[PDB]
Design a protein around this ligand. Structure first.
Ligand SMILES: Nc1ncnc2c1ncn2[C@@H]1O[C@H](COP(=O)(O)OP(=O)(O)NP(=O)(O)O)[C@@H](O)[C@H]1O
Ligand SMILES: [Mg+2]
Ligand SMILES: [Mg+2]
Lengths: 15, 335, 327
């Protein structure tokens, strides 16, 4: 199970 | 069916204003700046009086530059473009819009009662005829919006303003999209998201029916059906699907919610071929007159207490300065 | 006295740097570590393992990152501190920049935090103290880091923090305006565009500490704009399991008001270092790393990447050069 919520995935720097 | 007939006159008119949006319907000097009702990251909301009419309005000042800095350009144009084409009793009304060298302006009906979120919190929970009253209003609004190929994608208590007349008025269409097909953005709050969304499946209007299911549940219990203090667990608990009902849930309510909170898109109330009729006839809505509610000839359970920002906050009041220079002119000309 | 000398050697290096002390054909690129791209490398001659950040000259440009990258490189190579990853080498294989740093095999704090869910307050306090000191160091050089977050703090073999990703660090006596960072960690000032200073890191610290203790960060949503609104609200709810002294600290760190934000007042860090949450912290002991880590990642031997996720490996070949003259 891979949830794409920013509560689960690595958060990328504001580009 | 007068129902089917009225939604066509409605589609029609929505469509006129959609192709030909109304711009500059007013200007800054027509209003008195009373009070800051709220602030954000590229704008604020101000209590104002229209000078000639003497009527109060909630006015949205969007700093055009901030909007571009935060990449909100189309999200902004989109909300404006939608509010300005739309017309239904239970949606907040955009009375006027217009712009400066510096800002964007959205004058709304002022709704003093505040939002259902606080009230529900304040008073704990709602009786079922109480919850049903608000629920009836949402069903109609979705029936209306969906008719126009519009997904709301943001159902949640803090988006439901309560007017002096006690009726719900829906606000915030930042995330509403006009979509015939399917869409993929994660955007609504975690507690109201449908399984599809969480699984990046590619969803449609049936999402709002899922969310309505959640609203009703929370309104009736005082908390959402998939609660958890940890964000990730909110998501897991939705995908799992197990829902427990407080002892005090009418067998009708349980049956409704099972059909609303339903993974099986093929069995979810709203998405079936019988449409909203499945919901509007369900045994939990027997004691509700749909045209009376639309006409607001149904007594409301609750009513909140010339201004003032009683049920609002106090904020540091800023001048609404406007550059002698036109800012970000090109990208907002469609406003 | 210490800072005085640290502010000295950092100056000497900051005005007499090192460039191109290696070449691509001196390592056998073993695996991809993170994602730009970072690879576990092993030097031919030395045989030691390093981590090689490979930066694509053309995306850097196309993305307008020249100052920023010329920068991390410039600063990384000139800083010296126990919890700052060491840049071991650097050079440009004519199509992309290469920074070679010590390999820190423990992995992102991020993956351990997510795996576990949340650290205990004593565990969290252990890491917090290290960042508190790393910032004092860095601020004393008038640097702002601006990219605090779990995925940027690696755990070394002893379970001590190593900071990577200096992508956004700038030298700022005074004020700056650039909007960078990562949404969940941005202070109101940086969202709100009336300019800001190093006090932006102490706010970020409040976010990190909270996320460590809780498992999620104080201002949460699946879209940056929603996060911004929550940050500007500035309103925070704490878990019931949070200690009262913990609750206190975060209120002082997550202060919108630059006038009462801890670390940005009269006693600088000492207000943080002297707060009741930190009572049990021997600061000199942490600086020397003579404190036993409550957690140690499982490292087997040279070249284990089990602490890192897997990633597709693309090849790195040669065929926007004029712009990196001094890189
Ligand atoms: N010295 C190192 N040792 C181990 N892994 C590293 C190291 N430096 C970077 N990484 C990993 O790969 C990622 C790239 O990190 P970073 O320098 O934050 O570049 P980014 O391009 O800024 N995202 C980090 O998240 C770490 O996992
Ligand atoms: Mg990074
Ligand atoms: Mg970076």
């Amino acid at each position: 199970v891979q949830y794409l919520t920013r509560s689960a995935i690595r958060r990328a720097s504001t580009i | 069916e007068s129902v089917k007939e009225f939604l066509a006159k409605a589609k029609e008119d929505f469509l006129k204003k959609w192709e030909t949006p109304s711009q500059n319907t007013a200007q800054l000097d027509q209003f008195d700046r009373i009070k800051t009702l709220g602030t954000g990251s590229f704008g604020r909301v101000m209590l104002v009086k229209h000078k000639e009419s003497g009527n109060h309005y909630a006015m949205k000042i969007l700093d055009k530059q901030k909007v571009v800095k935060l990449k909100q350009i189309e999200h902004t144009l989109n909300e404006k473009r939608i509010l300005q084409a739309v017309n239904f009793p239970f949606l907040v009304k955009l009375e006027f819009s217009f712009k400066d060298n510096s800002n964007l302006y959205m004058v709304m009906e002022y709704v003093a009662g505040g939002e259902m979120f606080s009230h529900l919190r304040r008073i704990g929970r709602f009786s079922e005829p109480h919850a049903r009253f608000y629920a009836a209003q949402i069903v109609l609004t979705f029936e209306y919006l969906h008719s126009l190929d519009l997904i709301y994608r943001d159902l949640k208590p803090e988006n439901l303003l309560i007017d002096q007349q006690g009726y719900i008025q829906v606000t915030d269409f930042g995330f509403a999209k006009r979509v015939k097909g399917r869409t993929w953005t994660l955007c609504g709050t975690p507690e109201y998201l449908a399984p599809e969304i969480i699984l990046s499946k590619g969803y449609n209007k049936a999402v709002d029916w899922w969310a309505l299911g959640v609203l009703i549940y929370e309104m009736a219990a005082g908390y959402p059906p998939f609660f958890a203090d940890q964000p990730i667990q909110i998501y897991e608990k939705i995908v799992s699907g197990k829902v427990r009902f407080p002892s005090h849930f009418s067998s009708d309510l349980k049956d409704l919610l099972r059909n609303l909170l339903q993974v099986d898109l093929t069995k979810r109330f709203g998405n079936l071929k019988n449409g909203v009729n499945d919901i509007k006839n369900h045994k939990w809505f027997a004691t509700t007159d749909w045209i009376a509610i639309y006409q607001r000839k149904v007594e409301a359970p609750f009513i909140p207490k010339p201004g003032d920002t009683s049920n609002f906050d106090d904020y540091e009041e800023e001048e609404i300065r406007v550059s002698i220079n036109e800012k970000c002119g090109k990208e907002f000309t469609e406003f």
